[PDB]
């Protein structure tokens, strides 16, 4: 078989940065047919370089691939927010067709603060069963938080849900949501919750609250 | 047009037959594959085989044999795939892939054929609107939340008033939390924009039938 590994397994950047990758493959990819694909969080991958060096219409000019055989580059030059995905190449052994293992790009940028909002748990939820409250952190850098609940004073539940975000392609930006899940058989019951958020950025974790008001 | 159109999603048991297909529509027929790439649940890409759109060509992975039932049917164009003894980790998703050229690499890749393999039961989402409190916040331009309780299996699609405002869009994944996979979608529109201007939530789920329109 001929398989491919192109280590950094994750790797960094910043805009401007010349970041290079290699697809790794064995011996002489019988003639050298190479081709870098970026699948951007849960699509569809698309060719930016095919027959090795190649790039076509459709991507601008931070791109190079080139090597005989055994390596094979790929020159971004400079990176935009969208760079952010997985990139992976694919070959020959003279048939059948290996893939590789892709390299993860993580755009980096200055830090930015949580902007948390609450939504107190929907008409046709507890009409009909319990209440998700669900708390949305959105916007921010680096990826790393905690988010914990008041139940009442800053009761420690179980039974917490958690969503991050793909990396956005406009700000190198993450996001993510949290959920209480609990019974009428008892929202109905504990009156002042919130979502307490800690991250580098402030000092303070932020607190921002609710008790019975809005329906 | 051109197109490479797929349809999936199917949820088996363990055991089962996944009948899926892939239409090849607009070049010529007669020199092409149709190579069924398959993709890795938080994984890689791998290879099955290859299909002749014409004539019945399966040049095949050595792995791949068995599970393998790549065929074209003259008339109408298309080409299937008809894996069999499925098993908790065929439970990924499936492609159908291009040549214009020698790019030995296929430009025009297909769509998200999906398949889930499990033994639990089928559940329709139960859409929510959440609203906020009447207020004044961080900045001058609100933000609205949905959420989709826990449904079966993934996925679902959650969409926010089609067209005119395709406002901060971030959906948020999903834990497979018990059973169930729970889903939650945002915004943040302008405030004049809302309320004059309803927006609106809409959400299908292919094994329950569903869509739900909801409106804020
Ligand atoms: O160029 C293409 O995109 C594809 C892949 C393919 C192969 O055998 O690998 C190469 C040439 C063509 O005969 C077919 C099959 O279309």
């Known amino acids: 078989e001929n398989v491919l590994t192109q280590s950094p397994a994750i790797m960094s950047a910043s805009p401007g940065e010349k970041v290079t990758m290699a697809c790794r493959a064995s011996?002489?990819?019988?003639?050298?047919?190479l081709h870098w694909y970026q699948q951007k969080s849960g699509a569809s991958p698309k060719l930016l370089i095919y027959?090795?060096?190649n790039l076509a219409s459709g991507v601008p000019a931070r791109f190079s691939g080139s090597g005989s055989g055994t390596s094979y580059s790929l020159t971004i030059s400079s990176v935009e927010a969208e760079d952010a995905a997985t990139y992976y190449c694919?070959?020959?052994?003279?048939?059948?067709?290996?893939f590789g293992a892709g390299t993860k790009l993580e755009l980096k940028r200055a830090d930015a603060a949580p902007t948390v909002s609450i939504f107190p748990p929907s008409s046709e939820q507890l009409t009909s069963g319990g209440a998700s409250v669900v708390c949305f952190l959105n916007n921010f850098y680096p990826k790393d938080i905690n988010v914990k609940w008041k139940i009442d004073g800053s009761e420690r539940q179980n039974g917490v849900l958690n969503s991050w975000t793909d990396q956005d392609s406009k700000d190198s930006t993450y996001s993510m949501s949290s959920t209480l899940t609990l019974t009428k058989d008892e929202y109905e019951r504990h009156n002042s919750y919130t979502c307490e958020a800690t991250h580098k950025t402030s000092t303070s974790p932020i607190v921002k609250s609710f008790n019975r008001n809005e329906c | 047009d051109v197109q490479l159109q797929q349809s999936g999603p199917e949820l088996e048991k363990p055991g089962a037959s996944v009948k899926i297909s892939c239409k090849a529509s607009?070049?010529?027929?007669?020199?092409?594959?149709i190579n069924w790439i398959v993709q890795r649940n938080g994984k890689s890409l791998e290879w099955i085989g290859n299909?002749?759109?014409?004539?019945?060509?399966?040049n095949f992975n050595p792995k791949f044999k068995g599970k393998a039932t790549l065929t074209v049917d003259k008339s109408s164009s298309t080409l299937y795939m008809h894996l069999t003894s499925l098993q908790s980790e065929d439970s990924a998703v499936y492609y159908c892939?291009?040549?214009?050229?020698?790019?030995?690499?296929?430009?025009?890749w297909g769509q998200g054929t999906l398949v889930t393999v499990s033994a639990a039961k089928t559940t329709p989402p139960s859409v929510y609107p959440l609203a906020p409190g009447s207020a004044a916040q961080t900045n001058s331009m609100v933000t609205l939340g949905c959420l989709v309780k826990g449904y079966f299996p993934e996925p679902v699609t959650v969409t926010w008033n089609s067209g005119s405002l395709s406002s901060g869009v971030h959906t948020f994944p999903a834990v497979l939390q018990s059973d169930l996979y729970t889903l939650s979608s945002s915004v943040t529109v302008p405030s004049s924009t809302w309320p004059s201007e309803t927006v609106t939530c809409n959400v299908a789920h292919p094994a329950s039938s569903t869509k739900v329109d909801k409106k804020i």
């Open positions: 892939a291009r040549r214009r050229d020698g790019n030995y690499g296929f430009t025009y």
């Open positions: 607009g070049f010529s027929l007669p020199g092409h594959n």
């Open positions: 299909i002749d759109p014409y004539y019945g060509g399966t």
């Open positions: 011996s002489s990819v019988s003639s050298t047919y």
């Open positions: 027959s090795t060096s």
């Open positions: 694919q070959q020959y052994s003279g048939y059948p067709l290996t």
